[PDB]
Design brief:
The structure is a homotetramer. By secondary structure, the first copy, chain A, is an alpha/beta fold. Helices cover 24% and strands 30% of the residues of chain A. At the C-D interface, helix 2 and strand 3 of C face helix 2 and strand 3 of D. Chains A, C: Belongs to the purine/pyrimidine phosphoribosyltransferase family.
Chain lengths: 169, 167, 169, 167
């Protein structure tokens, strides 16, 4: 405890990147024809999902799922079916790559037309389980970050920008 | 089922209202001191929650709950609300039955304070007296979609509030 | 850790008591007319519920609920509605009286015709929150007990009898 | 909907079979060494689970799961099954689709071993090849109730397996 937070990725930049991601997601699926659904992982992805789904110019459903972050268990499964649909898992950040990994396995079992992941933040240096991540907003070093869904002791989750937890002594 | 969606509340108007609500909500708890948490009711309020919490200038946590004749908890909160100021975040209120119950349930956990902030309000359909401290818009009884709200699992992604036309 | 378990309440005695409880529950509701449902609290009440519901000679539904044992939260709510029905919460043991207390408040909100509690074991000396318990199988001192649903470090939950954890040194 | 329930498998026959299953299941894992857990699928198997685990003479944990076109987890396990022997406890298997999926899901968690033990089996209705290591009874395609199984949320409390007659 005892710290401060400084802006790392300004709100305006996040917006710009999400717009670009939006164009990409749109391009990648506009011609699929079949149903599409962006699946967000609670709690972390609520804000990113909000902004992102608005930038996706292709009709889709929005469902949320919440898995325990040693066994990965489902605390709240999807409400809608994903069989035969293009599914785009949406997370705020990927580091160890464990949850996204297992969640992706769980969902493939329901035999969807396709499965891809989209994460606002990517921390390559922390990957433990290799998992394919199609769309990434920003690649950053292993920095203590908060905001935009990412919390620190139940805090900063509502920050419109990505912050860096400094930590005084 | 064939239908049309017409804009009802354009994106900019919502943005502006959310900003006002933020100010109001901020002014209301900025001096509480106790911890604060905004509770969104899935699925419909995820978007409203995302934009609203950014406009709330007071350190708070963000949790979600999802409730369904009896009102049952499909997914409870992750946080304890006891002794905290709790702002329930809803997308829309009409009958008033659901918020009515969800509020009762949370009240049992004895929070510092309990309140509700709904984006839309169709007071023409209330069948239950329920305290609603914050309202973004009071509206006609139209079938609204967008900004989180759906229609046959559709339209939640629209950045504006729309009305289904049907024919 | 490092211990042994000795029989405290033999399986045959448990059966006898449950039969008696069964007669009582049956007597108490046989003339209600309205729907009845025994609500069990997982994990602990699964075995007790199994035996008990068979001793209740009055048509009823069997539903389960599972609440976190500081705020009491619902991890899995009831599947069926209880409004206007006689509800009999079923637990393996009541001590502090906290969970049963909150669970009872949660359920009264759904306005059932009636709410009562039935617990196999009662530990009066540990009550922190006073809550009415209509049917009790056995009243025991604050003993380290296991079996019949009550576990000790994920163990003894399948014992057909109530045991006492001795604890060597 | 008007109907009649006739006994199909009397209480004593079930008691005896459960005893046998216990012996079999016991003999099968008594030398594993690794931790063991029987997983019951709510709601229907709660009774079968209660009687079966008592007949299993090997230290184990007892957990429950409840699954629902897609097979979704309404309530996951409380325990981790990784590296443990897992015995899925079901009340009845017919199509085979549900157990089929639940098994896939648990398999992902990499348990020491995975198996299924169902009380009833209607092999005349299988549409999916699924491994079932233990079966209490193989039966005709009757509509069974009792011993946990229901009919319009009714009859789960019967101590015997019955068949609905309809007229
Ligand atoms: N899609 C959609 N859902 C609605 C509408 N009006 C009410 N609802 C549903 O009813 C709930 C609110 O119920 P209340 O609190 O009034 O009982 C909302 O969470 C929402 O899911 C509407 O116009 N469109
Ligand atoms: N009440 C009742 N449920 C049944 C019956 N046959 C199948 N089921 C349901 O189907 C599930 C098993 O499905 P399966 O594994 O064969 O796909 C059981 O958990 C049960 O809930 C029946 O005769 N009566």
């Amino acid at each position: 405890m005892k710290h401060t937070v400084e802006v790392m990725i300004p709100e305006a930049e996040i917006k710009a990147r999400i717009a670009e991601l939006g164009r990409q997601i749109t391009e990648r699926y506009k011609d699929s024809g079949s149903d599409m659904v962006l699946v967000g992982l609670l709690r972390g992805s609520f804000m990113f999902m909000a902004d992102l789904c608005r930038e996706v110019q292709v009709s889709h459903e929005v469902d949320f799922m919440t898995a325990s972050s040693r066994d990965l268990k489902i605390l709240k499964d999807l409400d809608e079916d994903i069989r035969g649909k293009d599914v785009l898992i949406v997370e705020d950040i990927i580091d160890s790559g464990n949850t996204l990994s297992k969640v992706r396995e769980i969902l493939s079992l329901r035999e969807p037309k396709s499965l891809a992941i989209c994460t606002l933040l990517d921390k390559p240096s922390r990957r433990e389980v290799n998992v394919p991540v199609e769309f990434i907003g920003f690649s950053i070093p292993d920095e203590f970050v908060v905001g935009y869904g990412i919390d620190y002791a139940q805090r900063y989750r509502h920050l419109p920008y990505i912050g860096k937890v400094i930590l005084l002594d």
